Amino acid sequence: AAKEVKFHDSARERLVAGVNLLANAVKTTLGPKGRNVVIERSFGAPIVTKDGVTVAKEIELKDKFENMGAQMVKEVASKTADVAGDGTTTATVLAQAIVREGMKYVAAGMNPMDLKRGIDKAVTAIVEELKAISKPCSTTKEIAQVGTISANADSSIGEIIAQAMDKVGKEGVITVEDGKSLENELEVVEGMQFDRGYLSPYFINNPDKQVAVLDNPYILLHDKKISNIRDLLPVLEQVAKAGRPLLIIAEDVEGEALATLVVNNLRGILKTCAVKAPGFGDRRKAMLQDIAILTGGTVISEEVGLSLEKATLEDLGQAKRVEVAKEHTTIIDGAGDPAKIQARVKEIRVQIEEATSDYDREKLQERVAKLAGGVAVIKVGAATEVEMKEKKARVEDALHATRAAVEEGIVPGGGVALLRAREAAVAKGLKGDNPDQEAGIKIVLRAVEQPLREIVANAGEEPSVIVAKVLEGKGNYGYNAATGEFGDMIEMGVLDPTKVTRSALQNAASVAGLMLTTECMIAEAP
């Protein structure tokens, strides 16, 4: 169709309008005293929320050229969120601040590329300083404290998180399942997680968690491509007559087969989910074999003398539960006997010494870890189903925060962390090779205080005086919007994982650079 093209300021200002309109809605839900945002529902009463994730997801504008910036900032915010579990509100606010300051200098005739380079230099310096301000958290007591703080002073959640992490590994897999009692419980079951997601968003069945969950399904293993629906019809018919859900692991599924699976999932004909097999090259067969032996199934392949047209339910693997997310899929309580699993673990461990390179050895070690480590399952316990729903979400959020916290430590939250990092970086000595790079540095130095300013503004106080008072303090000293007091932010349990702040700042800087160095904009004509 016909396109409409906008150049220079006439397009940068539309980007700015879009990002400003997205951020003005998102930032009202930032801080302990964040305001409410009312969102229309198609039917029934409007939904009111005070979290940035839901408000941002619903925001998309009428004008296409503003929607461009809105969606790019939303995408970078979601990229920040999915890897840290929080900060998408912070990332959008930081991006708005950086862009709003950057357009002032761009309109001043200053070089956009040098502005981008100065912004990158300042962000690199601030991130490098965050690695020093951050307090590490590796002791079980520290892990429990961080979990309790993230779970709103619920000590049981923190204790359960610590007990799951300290025996399965800080890099281990932890999942949450509804418990059978009032007290939370945990267990280790045979399972693994691999970095493969569902191939279509229609596969999801839990919009609240944005994941696909199947209960006691069959596992289909294939090492070749699947495009023809006929190639798996006799197997899916057996699965449907069996009545249990289906998880299909293949090299790829596309075309009429994928379309038919999507239609079946939408119509409720059969509960199906298809993901790409993990790894590539020769690692593909090893991954498929390990998954099959873990789920008790057999890989369907010509080299092993089986065909999908004749495959039966006996060849298929099975497990208690499989969770399919956007980036990774995990298997819970595979049907494989522990004896064969341990034998294969020993086989892989002795093949480790057969590695021809450090890359081979590290992949074999990853295989050993993903196979022998199992999956930690947290049985969240509470009195009622209504309390079940809330406690499960709280435990999941605490688990994500602890996973982020244990990797990079904790840092004074509420936006004080960025101020401390900025002051430390400036004291270290930060300069640009050009006056344009100097303005780029100034842009980030002014923008990194925006999260605290907006938290204070939503709290109702005057931003400038609070920011000045926070800057006059040193260390963990900061402002607590929940109570309005000044003191050690860590001591009151107001924390953010260093990963969250670092990722928010870096993604905001990236999107700000992209929409500062943008000179042309192409969109569909009205």
Next chain:
Amino acid sequence: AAKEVKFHDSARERLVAGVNLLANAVKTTLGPKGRNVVIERSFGAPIVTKDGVTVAKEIELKDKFENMGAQMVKEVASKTADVAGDGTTTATVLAQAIVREGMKYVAAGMNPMDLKRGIDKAVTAIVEELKAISKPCSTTKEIAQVGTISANADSSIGEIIAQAMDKVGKEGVITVEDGKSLENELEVVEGMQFDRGYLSPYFINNPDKQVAVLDNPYILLHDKKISNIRDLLPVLEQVAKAGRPLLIIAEDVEGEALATLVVNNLRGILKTCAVKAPGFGDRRKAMLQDIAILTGGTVISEEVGLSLEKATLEDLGQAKRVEVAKEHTTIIDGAGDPAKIQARVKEIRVQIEEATSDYDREKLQERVAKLAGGVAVIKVGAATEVEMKEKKARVEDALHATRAAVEEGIVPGGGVALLRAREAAVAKGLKGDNPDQEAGIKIVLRAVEQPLREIVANAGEEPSVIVAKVLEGKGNYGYNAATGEFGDMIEMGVLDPTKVTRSALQNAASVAGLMLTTECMIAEAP
């Protein structure tokens, strides 16, 4: 689709326009002398009503941003109504008053979060005072008096309500059925009520009562999920050839099965209703087994060796009547023999001593109560079917009022209760930590007199002088809009259950806080 976003006052004023236009229609039907409201019907003569429930239900504004507050206030009013049986007119009026006063302060630059906190403090103090003003009602004479007052001086209704309550329990289950004579009658039949509602509004068949009623149905018990329509087709076919209605109790029904059941109910193919099985965890099986033994059926489960594909009418339970409300479902006159029911009652009572925790013991006690208590059935008796319809509704309203009254006592109605509570709370000493909290206190103190002011205004008198005269009196002294006289409001039998006023005030405060602390609004663009 395209979204339209409004910020700050530009959105708060639309919320206020919506709530004001909803309340201006609702409040005309408040008080003994409430005016009429004429509502268009799609065909035939317009319906005229003088009750707030029907007027509010019909209000759907054109502008989306006004319909926002309209539907939110309607939702909180309905939440007040469904738990107390009345006060949705009062709740809307109180919400309008609080929001209209709060906007004056918010426009004055006054802090919204502190306004919300002051409103919450004032509401908590007033509610705490209501617990002291309220006259308790627990004697059979008191119960009969409250029932008679709620039933417009019909002593037979009050006597029947008292006789149903005093032998089945103040927490027992009481239902109303059409009698076979002129005089009202009551009886106790084997049955139970559990907190599970219909899974779709299409299941209802009595729009007057907003409930689903099935006569002499079959009871289907399943402990697993149902999504495939094929899983229950051979059973529904047998039921259809039998001709009796079907009630399906399962863990959950969704997808094509639920869609087919909805289509069948709409088309009149088969009278069906599906509700979730009560409880969760191990309590699920106990609930299903108790329900099956009460209805004479058997639970379809793999652990017991039965499948729904082969289930027959013999395995299904049956009862004289089942009523499915939005929140709870009750079973009347189950087919289970009293001997086995009493044996299971003894089994549960001796398992009570086997409880590992107080939570286990209290759930076992709840099981004992819900099983052995049965269901009280009130046979409403009158001369004609036209009089049947009116008397049944009057008895149901009196039963709801008595249930609300017996829980929290009675309090002087006509809005005098809130004035007495406000005066007592102010005399106790009520203050805010900020001038903003003081304004929040003042907002509620001025708003809690709105119900009496509107009752008087609909009665035609001047609100201010009547309110002042009521305030000059003490105790139960107040204004009776029915006759225009002043005196002990309890003595003329103008009463409201304490639950009704408390819930109305609290829900109005909650919705007012939500629409005061609202800064952003997202709705579909035109």
Next chain:
Amino acid sequence: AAKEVKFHDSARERLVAGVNLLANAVKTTLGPKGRNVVIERSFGAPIVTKDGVTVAKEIELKDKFENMGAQMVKEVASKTADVAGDGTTTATVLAQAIVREGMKYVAAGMNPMDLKRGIDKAVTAIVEELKAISKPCSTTKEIAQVGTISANADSSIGEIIAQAMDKVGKEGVITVEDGKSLENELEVVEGMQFDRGYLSPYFINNPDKQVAVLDNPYILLHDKKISNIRDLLPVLEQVAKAGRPLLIIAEDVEGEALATLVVNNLRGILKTCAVKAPGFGDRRKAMLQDIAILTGGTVISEEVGLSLEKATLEDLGQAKRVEVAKEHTTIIDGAGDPAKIQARVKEIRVQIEEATSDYDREKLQERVAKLAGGVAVIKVGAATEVEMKEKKARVEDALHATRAAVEEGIVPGGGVALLRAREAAVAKGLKGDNPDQEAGIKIVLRAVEQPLREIVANAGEEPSVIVAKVLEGKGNYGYNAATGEFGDMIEMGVLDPTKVTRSALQNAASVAGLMLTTECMIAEAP
């Protein structure tokens, strides 16, 4: 003609728009770093100014209803200025702040009369505190220091002001005349000043000083009314043939005589000025006789046997210079011989003992002071006429500041004085009898910080942090916008006379009360 009437908010908002449009222009010229304001001239290049007096004088709006508030605020600002010599910029800013805060509470339904009473109470408390914060200045060294500070560190101006004030009296009359050398000189000449101004603005001849100045004029003394032009034509003809200017002192002049004098002054036919004779009752004749003997003239009166139709130049008095201002007129170097003046001084001093009342004695003492004290004339000296023009204005401004300072002392300028007074008054305990009076108190407490906030904003810094830092200090500690430093405001020579701040605050409060308690507005229809 046709009138248009506006009521309530529809008129208060027009008042607010007018005062806001006046104050937004005026406040940009406030503070040491005040911005420039460019004003159109009818012909030639536009005039740029950075003083509030000129900007306010030129401001007059198109819409009549806004011009109402604009002109009332301008009138009260001019009333502040003419009695203190400065602060008309401060008064307008304070009035804008008070009104802008007051409309927030008025729109909140709060009682305007109680708001006005609370504003008056707060202003009274703050003014009472200013009488304690103010440092008195009565020593000659203090007077010289204040004069030097007001004259931009010109020690010669301060020394001359001190030498004029310490020998003629702190209540004495001091005037400025162009000198005959580089060094400033001072002298005492026979003269007096009385509180009578010119009867028409057309009499002025120095728009820069807004005064009427006549050089070596004739003095006409009459004790009766003058309306007929014929009554003084033979005298004005003699004066015109003489060629020297004319000053006419009479009970009153009106009608054709005043019109003819105005036309003659405009046409340049004759330099004339007419003022009312000072005093009333029997004091009128005493004033006229003293003025005549001071100027060497004779009073034209029937009781003394003279008529204005036959008056000659010999009867008229004369002096070196007369200055006619809006409120007062002064005579410099009267022709009366010092011997007769001293004899009349002794006569009045011995008549002092003849006074029948304390009021009579104090008026006789005022006569003695105004006659014997003479007039101090400052011969402002400098190199060039261009430097003459600037130095004369600087000396006049320093003289006005010293006159204001010596009466009520000095106080830390730059808006810190109002903050110190507010803090001291709040610590003393300030409360209102009503919540509306409490809001009225809060209005003034918030508004009195507006001058410092705007000085800082024009200086470019952030207002809130600077105000908070100033409040954290005590005593004379404050912010200096000239250099951006913090310290003792008095030590850096940034001062305001207590009269200036007190008058600005009181007049702003008065006009704010008038335009807060305004409910109707009448203006000419389009």
